[PDB]
């Protein structure tokens, strides 16, 4: 589908509210496999199970290993911009 840019608002006591799978070492993108009900990703409205996360706050995640992506994603705070695509 089309590449989309999606804004998420996270409070400091929260995680993102997603499960991710994938990673470069597995030959697949960082993929959203779950969205937790009521947590920030659900609340933002624009993220869906099956979305690939291409970038977060301008950091490319297309070529990142799984644990690299975890570190990068978990570092982001507050108003967080995602670039995503549903294939």
């Amino acid at each position: 589908g089309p590449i989309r840019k999606v804004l998420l608002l996270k409070e400091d006591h929260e995680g993102l509210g997603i499960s991710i799978t994938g990673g470069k070492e597995h030959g697949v993108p960082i993929l959203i496999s779950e969205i937790h009900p009521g947590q920030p990703a659900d609340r933002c409205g624009g993220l869906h199970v099956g979305d690939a996360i291409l970038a977060v706050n301008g950091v490319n995640l297309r070529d990142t290993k799984h644990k690299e992506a975890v570190t990068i994603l978990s570092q982001q705070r507050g108003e967080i911009e995602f670039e995503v695509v549903y294939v």
Binding site: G15, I18, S19, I20, T21, H26, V28, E34, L73
Partner: peptide, 10 residues
């Protein structure tokens, strides 16, 4: 996709 990739809750 790849079922062999791990999953992290974040």
């Amino acid at each position: 996709a790849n079922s062999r990739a791990p999953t992290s809750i974040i």
